Symmetry: C2
Amino acid sequence: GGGVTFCGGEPLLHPEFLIDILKRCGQQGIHRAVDTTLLARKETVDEVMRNCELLLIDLKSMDSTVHQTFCDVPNELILKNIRRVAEADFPYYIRIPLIEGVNADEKNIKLSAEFLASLPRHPEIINLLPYHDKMQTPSEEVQQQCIQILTDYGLKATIGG
Amino acid sequence: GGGVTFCGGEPLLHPEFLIDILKRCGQQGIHRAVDTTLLARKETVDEVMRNCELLLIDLKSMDSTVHQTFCDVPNELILKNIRRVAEADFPYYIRIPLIEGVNADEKNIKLSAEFLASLPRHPEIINLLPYHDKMQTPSEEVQQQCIQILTDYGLKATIGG
């Protein structure tokens, strides 16, 4: 059936507007997914959850320095938000844009798995999105190794959206 | 920055509502993308284009029988809509969920390329989305062969979203 998705940072800079549109979509029976990666305020995350079906959060790196370099923001808030959604027992997806040279190392993926596995509710799915365009596309071998790691920690993972 | 995306068939069953939400998002400066794959009426496609930044259309198969089997609809309208957007000189993306056993054959991809290449405006990008879950994930070799075909016809293509 599809639905509506809000992605990225910009929608979150219009939080009252976002909630209004989400409410309108709910009335029309349209499925709603919202990227809350960069949402600063916990009351807003709570209100978004009251007005959608699914949260989407990017987990680009467990290394805050890598995260700051590529996202212009540290990861402390991202991790807090993932924990908050998990503790709310609310459905969420985790997306990991997978970039050889940035975040496809065994260490990062294991730290990611350990964080997620420890949460009281796991993600519905973890989407590994191989980079296509150092920053290189991870090999098929690396991609599958990442899937295996996540699977080994009891998490559900796939390549692609 | 991200933005809002409407995907799938359901939003298109509420066309007046869709246009209203698109208008509201435009006022707030939010980028808008709309999946118009299944839009029946040309006046609605035109109105959607007046109220968004980008169209998204799925091209699952050039074989209408394959399309009917997997989508419960023939592809005649899908092809008409792609032509209409192209003739309107409006930005669009084409998505091809790429499934070994359904649509990753050289014939289908070549027919797809020939159709798209012939249009007065090409897609901004063609996203090949390999199936993960006969219906099998296409091999790395097949994926790259599909990219090469599209590239050979002068089209811009990539693996993943």
